[PDB]
């Protein structure tokens, strides 16, 4: 119904952006996260979303693992950017 | 997606100097 | 003239209705627009205030925008950056 976060308004961190996480390469999710904040803050969203250990899933960013600890800013994420999640049950 | 997004990040904005409001309109 | 004191900004609501607002230069326009939202009933999030030809941010300030006490804040509802 509602949609916040600067629709493509990534300037200089501390200006929250929407983060898209693609899980199991079957669909996508759109998270809203600033940047300077570790991605591990985001990596659990998907979980609370799909029911994932958070630590068990595997995320990625345009050419980066973004090992949660990685903050979007540090890596240079953007609004609506995506972070692919690939984690089997094995 | 359909649904909010929890994560809670650092601050959002900073105000160096202060100021009041006005009427008009 | 004006360094870090107040300055009046004219915010236009796309419909041709602008408003005057004194906002201290080094102050985030988020206040001036907050008054605009106050003036009517906008959301301030669904709104994007553009400065005389210059996308605006809640944190953007007149100084930061080289405005003055005789400039104009342009208003646009959702379209600019954040």
UniProtKB/Swiss-Prot annotation, chain B:
Tissue expression remark: In the embryo, expressed primarily in the developing nervous system with strong expression in the dorsal root ganglia and gonads. Ubiquitously expressed in the adult.
SUMO interaction motif 3 (motif): residue ranges: 17-19
Transmembrane stretches, start-end: none
Motif (SUMO interaction motif 2): 6-9
Covalent S-S links between cysteines: none
Subcellular location: Cytoplasm; Nucleus; Nucleus, PML body
Post-translational modification comment from the UniProt entry: Sumoylated; conjugated by one or two SUMO1 moieties. Autoubiquitinated.
Domain remarks in the Swiss-Prot or TrEMBL record: The SUMO interaction motifs (SIMs) mediates the binding to polysumoylated substrate.
Assembly information from the UniProt record: Homodimer (via RING-type zinc finger domain). Interacts with GSC2. Interacts with AR/the androgen receptor and TBP. Interacts with TCF20. Interacts with PATZ1. Interacts with TRPS1; negatively regulates TRPS1 transcriptional repressor activity. Interacts with PML (isoform PML-1, isoform PML-2, isoform PML-3, isoform PML-4, isoform PML-5 and isoform PML-6). Interacts with PRDM1/Blimp-1.
Protein name: E3 ubiquitin-protein ligase RNF4
Curated annotation (Swiss-Prot), chain C:
PTM text: Cleavage of precursor form by SENP1, SENP2 or SENP5 is necessary for function.
Domain Ubiquitin-like: 5-82
Domain of life: Eukaryota
GO molecular function, one term: protein tag activity
Effect of substituting residue 23 to A: Impaired interaction with USP25
Cross-link (Glycyl lysine isopeptide (Gly-Lys) (interchain with K-? in acceptor proteins)): 82
Coiled coil: none
Tissue note: Expressed predominantly in liver.
A GO BP annotation: regulation of protein localization to nucleus
Recorded GO CC terms: cytoplasm; kinetochore; nucleoplasm; nucleus; PML body
Localization per record: Cytoplasm; Nucleus; Nucleus, PML body
UniProt keyword annotations, A-Z: Cytoplasm, Isopeptide bond, Nucleus, Ubl conjugation, Ubl conjugation pathway
Family: Belongs to the ubiquitin family. SUMO subfamily.
Protein purpose: Ubiquitin-like protein which can be covalently attached to target lysines either as a monomer or as a lysine-linked polymer. Does not seem to be involved in protein degradation and may function as an antagonist of ubiquitin in the degradation process. Plays a role in a number of cellular processes such as nuclear transport, DNA replication and repair, mitosis and signal transduction. Covalent attachment to its substrates requires prior activation by the E1 complex SAE1-SAE2 and linkage to the E2 enzyme UBE2I, and can be promoted by an E3 ligase such as PIAS1-4, RANBP2 or CBX4.
Subunit structure of this chain's protein: Covalently attached to a number of proteins. Interacts with BMAL1. Interacts with USP25 (via ts SIM domain); the interaction sumoylates USP25 and inhibits its ubiquitin hydrolyzing activity. Interacts with SAE2 and UBE2I.
Name of the protein in question: Small ubiquitin-related modifier 3
Source organism (scientific name): Homo sapiens
């Amino acid at each position: 119904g509602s949609e916040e976060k600067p629709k493509e308004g990534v300037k200089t961190e501390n200006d929250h952006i929407n983060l898209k996480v693609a899980g199991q390469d079957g669909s996508v999710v759109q998270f809203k996260i600033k940047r300077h904040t570790p991605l591990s803050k985001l990596m659990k969203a998907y979980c609370e979303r799909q029911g994932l250990s958070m630590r068990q899933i595997r995320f990625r960013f345009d050419g980066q693992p973004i090992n949660e600890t990685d903050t979007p800013a540090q890596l240079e994420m953007e609004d609506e950017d995506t972070i692919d999640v690939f984690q089997q049950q094995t | 997606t359909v649904g909010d997004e929890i994560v809670d990040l650092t601050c959002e904005s900073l105000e160096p100097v202060v100021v009041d409001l006005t009427h008009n309109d």
